[PDB]
Amino acid sequence: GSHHHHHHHMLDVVKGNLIVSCQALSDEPLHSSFIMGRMAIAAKQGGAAAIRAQGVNDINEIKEVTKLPIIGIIKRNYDDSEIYITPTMKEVDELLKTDCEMIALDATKRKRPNGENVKDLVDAIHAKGRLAMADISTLEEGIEAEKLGFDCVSTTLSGYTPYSKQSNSVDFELLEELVKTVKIPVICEGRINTPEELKKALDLGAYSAVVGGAITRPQQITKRFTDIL
Amino acid sequence: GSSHHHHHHMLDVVKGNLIVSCQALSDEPLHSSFIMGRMAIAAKQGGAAAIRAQGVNDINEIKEVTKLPIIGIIKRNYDDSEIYITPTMKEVDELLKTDCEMIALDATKRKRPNGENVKDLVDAIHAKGRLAMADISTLEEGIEAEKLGFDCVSTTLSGYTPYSKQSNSVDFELLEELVKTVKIPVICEGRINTPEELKKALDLGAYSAVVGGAITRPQQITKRFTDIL
Ligand SMILES: CC(=O)N[C@@H](C=O)[C@@H](O)[C@H](O)[C@H](O)COP(=O)([O-])[O-]
Numbered sequence: 001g002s003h004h005h006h007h008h009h010m011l012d013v014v015k016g017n018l019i020v021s022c023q024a025l026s027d028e029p030l031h032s033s034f035i036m037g038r039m040a041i042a043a044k045q046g047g048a049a050a051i052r053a054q055g056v057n058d059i060n061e062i063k064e065v066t067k068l069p070i071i072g073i074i075k076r077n078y079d080d081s082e083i084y085i086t087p088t089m090k091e092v093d094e095l096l097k098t099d100c101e102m103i104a105l106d107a108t109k110r111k112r113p114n115g116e117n118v119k120d121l122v123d124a125i126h127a128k129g130r131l132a133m134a135d136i137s138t139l140e141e142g143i144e145a146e147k148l149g150f151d152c153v154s155t156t157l158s159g160y161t162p163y164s165k166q167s168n169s170v171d172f173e174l175l176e177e178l179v180k181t182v183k184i185p186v187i188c189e190g191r192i193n194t195p196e197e198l199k200k201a202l203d204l205g206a207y208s209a210v211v212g213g214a215i216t217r218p219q220q221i222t223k224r225f226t227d228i229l
Numbered sequence: 230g231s232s233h234h235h236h237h238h239m240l241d242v243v244k245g246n247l248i249v250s251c252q253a254l255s256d257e258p259l260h261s262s263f264i265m266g267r268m269a270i271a272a273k274q275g276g277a278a279a280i281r282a283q284g285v286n287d288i289n290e291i292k293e294v295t296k297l298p299i300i301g302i303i304k305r306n307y308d309d310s311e312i313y314i315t316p317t318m319k320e321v322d323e324l325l326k327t328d329c330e331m332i333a334l335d336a337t338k339r340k341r342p343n344g345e346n347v348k349d350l351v352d353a354i355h356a357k358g359r360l361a362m363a364d365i366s367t368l369e370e371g372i373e374a375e376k377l378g379f380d381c382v383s384t385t386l387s388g389y390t391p392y393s394k395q396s397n398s399v400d401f402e403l404l405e406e407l408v409k410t411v412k413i414p415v416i417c418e419g420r421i422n423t424p425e426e427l428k429k430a431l432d433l434g435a436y437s438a439v440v441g442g443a444i445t446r447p448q449q450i451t452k453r454f455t456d457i458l
Pocket residue numbers: 021023073156157160189190191192210211212213214
């Protein structure tokens with residue numbers, strides 16, 4: 001198979017720039033592809049180079065109204081797994097029905113639903129010419145992500161698995177250690193609240209960074225303000 | 230003649246607490262009464278004690294989905310005045326059609342459309358038993374506002390009139406000076422970006438404070454992140 005060559009490519013475009021996650025799950029006040037589309041427009045107009053989005057309907061709305069590169073995931077609980085970020089081939093195939101250029105998935109060491117292997121998911125993604133991001137919680141998971149064929153790794157799940165570093169602030173340590181040890185792009189994702197933290201992450205060698213809640217979750221932004229009173 | 234008594238009163242409710250402004254005018258990404266309603270819900274669930282909203286549609290939706298106390302304004306240009314925050318009796322009367330418990334209006338030294346005076350507008354607001362907030366730009370405007378019987382004063386317009394202090398950051402100076410000289414509630418409003426600034430304003434004697442863009446304008450939040458890169 002063949003297709004036409006584009007001038008701009010996702011990894012080149014996010015390099016040293018900000019990716020904005022526009023996510024609002026079913027228990028959140030902005031749950032609606034209409035609203036997540038408006039959030040992406042705002043992120044675009046504020047200088048975001050790419051968007052991270054959850055669910056086929058949000059992804060498709062964001063792509064239409066922004067034309068930005070997208071990192072797509074589907075979050076879904078399964079009874080037989082702790083994994084919820086794009087846990088199976090069923091979610092991978094749903095995401096490949098969208099135009100999102102990259103698909104992130106949980107690349108932790110943990111057991112996946114139906115006893116599926118991460119390599120198969122990663123191979124399915126590459127088979128359709130997409131990119132694969134490995135959301136990880138620890139340094140070894142990141143090191144293994146590279147070996148599995150991932151195009152890039154993200155610290156998304158650090159502090160969100162029981163065996164990774166438990167923290168309320170950005171895991172800069174993980175970032176540094178990934179940078180010493182993998183060749184592929186290391187993206188810093190998780191609990192970036194301020195411009196200073198974002199600069200620090202890129203200063204520490206992050207290829208790019210994702211900021212979600214501190215831009216697109218007004219409830220969380222509000223809480224951070226009211227917590228200080 | 231008379232109405233039933235409520236336990237909670239807007240000025241009592243906001244004291245020491247955060248007011249969130251949920252505005253998106255027609256050139257902004259989140260422009261939509263539905264979207265402002267959801268933002269207000271988020272803001273509520275984050276601990277906001279009241280909401281400031283622009284226009285009858287936004288106000289009505291926000292009252293409906295949050296039941297929070299609302300400071301209402303209409304922003305509208307007139308070709309015979311530089312004032313746009315609730316400039317005339319027209320806007321006052323439209324706002325009194327809503328249930329908003331407080332109405333903010335420009336109470337600068339400047340001439341209003343049609344040569345209307347601010348005292349008349351305040352008297353109409355009081356005539357229906359509502360509260361009147363004075364958005365000011367200077368110490369003397371605040372002193373005068375109190376003289377006219379405004380129920381509170383806000384530093385909303387410091388840096389948004391040519392004769393007031395030009396800054397890109399919170400006008401703490403003005404806040405301190407007003408707290409020292411006026412007996413009515415002084416509300417810090419304009420360019421609060423961090424919880425640290427919020428605490429500082431309350432620490433300097435602000436009765437309460439308003440934060441808008443740093444919570445509810447994702448574009449301005451994104452910009453602050455991308456500016457640092
Ligand atoms: C743990 C988990 O499921 N994390 C993320 C999955 O995408 C998501 O909830 C988060 O908002 C983004 O990663 C961006 O991070 P932050 O900037 O919102 O902290």
